[PDB]
Amino acid sequence: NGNSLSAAELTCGMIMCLARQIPQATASMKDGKWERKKFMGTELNGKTLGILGLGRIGREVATRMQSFGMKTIGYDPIISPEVSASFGVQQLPLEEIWPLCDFITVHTPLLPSTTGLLNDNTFAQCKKGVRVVNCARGGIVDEGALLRALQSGQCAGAALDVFTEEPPRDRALVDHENVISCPHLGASTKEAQSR
Amino acid sequence: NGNSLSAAELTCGMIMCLARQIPQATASMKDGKWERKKFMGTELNGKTLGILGLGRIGREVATRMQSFGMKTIGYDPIISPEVSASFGVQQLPLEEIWPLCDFITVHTPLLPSTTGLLNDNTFAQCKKGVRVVNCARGGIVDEGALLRALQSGQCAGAALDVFTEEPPRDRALVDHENVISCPHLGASTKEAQSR
Ligand SMILES: NC(=O)c1ccc(F)c(Cl)c1
Ligand SMILES: NC(=O)c1ccc(F)c(Cl)c1
Numbered sequence: 001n002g003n004s005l006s007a008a009e010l011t012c013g014m015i016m017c018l019a020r021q022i023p024q025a026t027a028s029m030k031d032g033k034w035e036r037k038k039f040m041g042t043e044l045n046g047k048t049l050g051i052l053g054l055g056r057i058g059r060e061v062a063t064r065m066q067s068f069g070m071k072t073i074g075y076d077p078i079i080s081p082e083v084s085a086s087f088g089v090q091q092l093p094l095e096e097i098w099p100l101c102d103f104i105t106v107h108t109p110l111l112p113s114t115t116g117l118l119n120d121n122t123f124a125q126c127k128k129g130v131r132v133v134n135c136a137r138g139g140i141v142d143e144g145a146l147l148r149a150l151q152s153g154q155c156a157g158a159a160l161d162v163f164t165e166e167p168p169r170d171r172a173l174v175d176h177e178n179v180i181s182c183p184h185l186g187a188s189t190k191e192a193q194s195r
Numbered sequence: 196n197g198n199s200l201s202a203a204e205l206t207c208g209m210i211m212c213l214a215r216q217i218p219q220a221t222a223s224m225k226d227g228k229w230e231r232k233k234f235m236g237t238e239l240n241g242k243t244l245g246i247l248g249l250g251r252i253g254r255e256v257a258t259r260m261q262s263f264g265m266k267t268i269g270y271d272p273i274i275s276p277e278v279s280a281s282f283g284v285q286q287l288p289l290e291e292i293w294p295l296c297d298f299i300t301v302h303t304p305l306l307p308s309t310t311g312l313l314n315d316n317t318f319a320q321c322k323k324g325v326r327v328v329n330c331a332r333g334g335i336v337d338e339g340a341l342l343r344a345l346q347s348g349q350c351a352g353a354a355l356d357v358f359t360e361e362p363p364r365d366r367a368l369v370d371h372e373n374v375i376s377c378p379h380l381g382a383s384t385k386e387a388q389s390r
Contacts, residue, residue: 005240009263013215016208023212023221025377029369030222034362034378043386045200067262068204167229174224182220183229191238 001056003192008060010186011105011135014159015065018103018131019044021157023180042102045069050097052117053107053136054079054089061105062089073097098125105133106140116142123149129156135186138162143173150176161186196251201387203255205380206300206330209354210260213298213326214239216352218375237297240264245292246284247312248302248331249274254282256300268292293320298328305332315340324351330381333357338368345371356381 017023020041028035049065051058051074062072066088073090074097081091092100104126108114118132119142132155134141143164149155150173157178166184168174174181187193212218215236223230244260246253246269257267261283268285269292276286292299299321303309313327314337327350329336338359344350345368352373361379363369369376382388 005264006238009211009239010215010217012263013208013211013217016204016211017217020205020208020377020380022205022208022375022377023218025380026218026375027222027225029376029378032366036378036380036383039378039380039383040388041380041384043201043384044204045386064262067259068207069200171227180217180221181224182215182217182234183224183231185215185220185231185234185236188231188234189236189238191240193235 002195003187004056004060006189006192007057007135007186008064010161010182011057011061011107011133012064014133014135014161014180015044015049015103015105015131017180018133018157018159024177047071047102048073048100050074050101050104051089051107052076052094052097052104054084054091055107057136058105058107059087059089061107062087070103073100094122095125098122099127101127101130103131103133106136108136108140110137110139115139116145118142118145120145120148123154126154128154131155131157131159133159135159135161138164138166143170147172147176150178197390198382198384198387199251199255201384202252202330202381203259205356205377206252206256206302206328207259209328209330209356209375210239210244210298210300210326212375213328213352213354219372242266242297243268243295245269245296245299246302247271247289247292247299249279249284249286250302252331253300253302254284256302257282257284265298268295289317290320293317294322296322296325298326300328301331301335303331303335305334310334311337311340313337313340315343318344318349321349323349326350326352326354328354330354330356333361334359338365342367342371345373
């Protein structure tokens, strides 16, 4: 609320980090390497961003990523399509979202309906090479399914601020070359902290 | 031109990585650590971004970063104030830019007038804790002066896509904890490459 913009800004950061592999490129430089071919990336302009959860954080994400020319679609069980249209998000049923997205970001609470919202079934309906962000709640993205989708290339990259257990004991996701991560930093700014 | 957006997008990525230390946090997580205090960050909203160079790239950066609530000021000797106003950038003489900025990004050619545009003299006129981005040309920021500013805290962080020599033989900047780096990836996208 007081921390909505901190959250939204970390999410946008993560999206940019996935498009350009900035954390991986920094690690590579720090290891003494100069690896230009390895870190060929993608432009955000013209890509589709699906936003699951169209509350304050999701809305803030949307208007920022609209400035980059992303097409912003999404889903929210409460917010009407005319209202989301007023902040530039096209609402579609979930089943229509999966195959359209280049990026997916989640901004929901953790409920039975949202636990494993992204799972083996929903990854298989995604466009091959989708990139996923979870800066909301650990478990919205099923971690097992995410790992399997990273291993197959079905998911080209994930950015995780949050984990089912914190700190995470299973390290397979964190250690993956296409996963970027933070120790639950979404609200960790001097401004959010200092009301 | 064809690569203006790729450049702009990397620059904005780097600004977000400086505000939130996403590359350093990823490396930390990958080393099995969970270091939440260490990576307390800042919000972009309400901060001033100084844009030196107000051509296509600089303009694209400005309108992206305006969506985050940054105040965008800048300088370009050849772009009229009226043209820059049309994309929300207030032009000021260089001497007025330095003390205002929380972040400074450069989008100029490498000319005698811009070589060491950020040097010891201009760092000393910056607000303490300025963060700097160079995704333009190696040598616009004097590397020696940047290291000295990082060591004193005058500069709180820097993001470099480009170096005076490539790959850099002096590793003190790349190795600094508050420096994020890439192996000259500003035009490395499938879209820029594939006209
Ligand atoms: N129940 C929910 O809040 C819910 C369930 C499914 C979803 F995709 C979203 Cl965005 C929210
Ligand atoms: N000569 C130039 O092109 C030049 C000199 C100083 C500057 F700050 C800028 Cl943006 C450009």
